[PDB]
Symmetry: C5
Subunit: 257 residues, 5 copies
């Protein structure tokens, strides 16, 4: 079962994370910005697909989007960069296991979250400058999707955030339990497919959604309050799924007590 070995690996990763931040904020933030941008790249692609297929009235739209999102977290895992959603399980487990403090945990969460946002912001501006969202079905897909995410009840967003980060974090969990990089990507592929097509909410992906929506002059269905509204609810949900379910879960499984 290797639950102790697994918890031992998560504890080390938590430690390595807080060490990296303490050693160099610039390294930690660049890492976070890359992850934020890598996740956003998955959004650019599946929203392009969403625009193309919704316009055709395809029934496969949300299925093809889910199948196509794999790159988001695959890039993060293969580049070894810092993403807020994964850090919910990692810091949580390492903290319960006395590897790191609550303060360390807050630091890592806040810095990776802000760094992820910087990467989303950067990608958004650049994407807008491509003219790819000047007008047409892709722009319209950004605008409609952003508006629907911004107007869902808090409770619904919260609970979707929870299920989303159980899925993200369990695929990160899998990556700590296999030595086959191909098996890692596959599990990531399956988990992102499940969470996208099922309708769960990913805070870091949402940053790029609102980034593009706000920066684009052609899109005007949502405001910054809406963006912040959705981001807060979903982030809170993400934290609950990652730390309360996956982090506590893996702690309980591996703790020699």
């Amino acid at each position: 079962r290797a639950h102790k070995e697994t918890l031992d690996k998560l504890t080390n990763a938590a430690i390595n994370k807080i060490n990296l931040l303490n050693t160099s904020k610039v390294k930690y933030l660049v890492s976070s910005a890359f992850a934020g941008l890598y996740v956003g790249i998955g959004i650019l692609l599946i929203f392009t697909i969403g625009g193309l297929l919704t316009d055709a009235g395809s029934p496969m739209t949300k299925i093809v989007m889910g199948l196509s999102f794999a790159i988001a977290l695959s890039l993060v895992i293969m580049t070894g960069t810092e993403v807020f959603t994964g850090n919910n399980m990692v810091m949580s487990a390492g903290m319960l296991n006395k590897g790191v403090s609550i303060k360390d945990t807050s630091k890592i969460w806040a810095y990776s979250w802000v760094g992820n946002l910087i990467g989303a912001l950067v990608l958004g501006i650049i994407f807008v400058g491509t003219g790819l969202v000047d007008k047409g079905p892709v722009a319209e897909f950004f605008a409609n999707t952003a508006a629907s995410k911004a107007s869902m009840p808090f409770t619904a967003l919260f609970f979707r955030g929870i299920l989303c980060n159980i899925l993200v974090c369990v695929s990160v969990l899998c990556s700590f339990r296999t030595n086959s990089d191909t098996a890692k990507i596959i599990m990531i592929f399956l988990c992102l497919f499940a969470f996208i097509t099922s309708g769960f909410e990913h805070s870091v992906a949402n940053m790029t959604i609102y980034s593009v929506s706000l920066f684009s002059p052609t899109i005007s269905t949502v405001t910054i309050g809406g963006a912040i509204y959705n981001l807060v609810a979903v982030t809170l949900g993400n934290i609950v799924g990652g730390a309360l379910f996956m982090g506590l879960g893996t702690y309980i499984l591996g703790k020699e007590k």
Copy 2:
């Protein structure tokens, strides 16, 4: 290497009962995770089912099958405890004298209940998303639960047998390869076959019923409908996993 496989099944059976005797909390938490992991596969393919049924696609059941792999892949990759696979493992470990019938029924009971706890928690949180307040996906849960609860016992029993043959044989494959990619592929193929052919999985049905019982959508379900199905399918699962795969692997491996 049938002998070596039998030994692996036996050692796994021993670790299972050892875990339970050491910590119920750890055993049940492992079980609740597995029940949740399987349920997640159900959320995915019922979302697909809803979407494609609404559109009248003839591919509906085929896509549902192709998309169920995550269910058991997560269980295997996380090393957690699912009732279905435990039928073969404890059954073979028992015939091979690593564990007793008492241990076997303890494991089955605890993993079954733990799986259910996972299903219930998943159902609650999923209903809370608002994703099945109304529309084709909500309707797919209601209709699918109702057709499953109204099936004759015999039909459910036999579908339970074939389903767990498929689940247990993919577990067996996972014991006969060192490749995790090969493991996931075999699991993918076996789940594809059981979902699309129309076989019945007791743990997955737990999420089907917890979702339906928690959602405000008015089905024709009832708790007695769910229990009826779960009982018939569980017994079918036990026969397929213990009598076929369990006994079968003992016979191939037993250095007599």
Copy 3:
């Protein structure tokens, strides 16, 4: 290359097969019964697919069926069970290499064939009992396909059997020439796709087609006499394909020239 090493492996597999049989008819038939069952599972899957897409008039039908048949031989290989079709190459090669005898070989063929049949019969009974073949497009796909295979001329069935088992056996051969379990599954997937979609005939798989069809009470248009006819033609087909083509072929490729402890190449 590495044909001699492969030939030794085939030979060893043959020796182990007969050793096992001699040691335990029960162990051997149980292994064969699983394989028949594992192959049949593939049939239950692709026939469900066939039923669904035929009923919808989809042109993709036979393509999707072929793409979805991989589970059949993949389960056999990954479970190390005994399937008649594969045994045709292995026993054949092992014999030519002085490892097993014509006697041992016909025994394995007979025992694995009957064993595969036991697996199909059980699966058919169990499957029919699910109610999934009571009525509808899948029941009909079984009935119609069972009828078309049994009403086909012997020559067509025979040659279809040759090509089927060439593919089945070459995929088994690939599994002897790689250490990667994933490459094994992929190669099996490719070969089973080719053979199902192109329309070749597989004897063990046909055992499940007729078992489900004979055990089913949704009409007939069949006859256990029709099944036997098909099973016989296809089986002889599978035999030459696996033994005359793949078996002899691998022997020739791998037989060290210095032996020559009986025959000379050129």
Copy 4:
């Protein structure tokens, strides 16, 4: 990067090929016959697909055909059998690197070619015997395709042959540059997808196209001369792509100078 290692591998494979022939022509011809038939099996499949989908009026026909051809060269690589096409790169590089003579190379080309043809003749005979090409969309697909290939201008077949064997040989090249069988199969899959769907000409695959079309009693409009014409032009193109592009290219990269 390991170009010299690679050229050493090509040269050693070329030496092993001419040694096999000198040692045993029947072994060599049996190996070639297997290769010719393995390739032909790909044609039987994708022509069935071609038949089915052409009859459907589907725009995906040539795409699905391309994706389904991988079995052809995968079988050859995994069985270690002798196929003419790939032999163009291997014997030319090994020759340029002074491991084999010009005479050896032409012996290997002639024998693998005649051997491949023998494999295709056997397959086409057995295939017609199945009654699968007595009538229907598949028989027709065989009949039309054989006729369109035979009536093509020489220059067009020649250049198609070149690009086909660049793709065949580069995927044989990859097979020498990885120790992963899965990676090998994937590259063969991508390259065969590419050459089929783009419309390039493969001499050995054509042998099976013409053995079926000509051996089939259900009529057509090919003729033996038409078959020979296509085979000569495509074979010449295959040689140029494999030897002059891939062979010479890999020699230059890897040559100890």
Copy 5:
């Protein structure tokens, strides 16, 4: 983590490239010509797909094209050949790490670029010679796509170039961080899926687009000056994405400070 190890690897690859160029321009240009031709092979394929599916009015056209482009960078990685785009990250990182100089970097960029073009030119001549772009939906797809690429505003081309090479270079980065060839190909497949389908601009792929369009007598939409316009704007964007984002970024993560 292992950023430092990754940076040593890039630096070492940078050193190996400049050494190869100094030792033999021929070996280096031939490697470059191959890569340009390998990338162009992906263009030939996905443009065939584009013609077929556009002609049929399929809404899957752009998605199937992206899914089918993996062969381009897969060949380059697996054959170990020199492509300009990937060189933007490798050289810039190697140079920042003091392994190679600014002069080495501009020399590698210019030679790989020109080498890639030669490969593009050679492929274009030969593809035209196949008769495959004589008339019909595929020739039309080249013509229309080349025109639209040449008539796009500079800023749009530039930013598309940035996002394209971040995707190309990150897949090259992943290839440096795994020992699994299969995982390399998967990551390449994903990144190329993302960049094609999203609409980003690849300078080396574009050389074949204009190669085919210009050499063909039946295509009359673009002109040489148009190709140069596109190639300049896109090459500049590619450089920024590979060197400024990816190169500078992996240095910062990796630099033992």
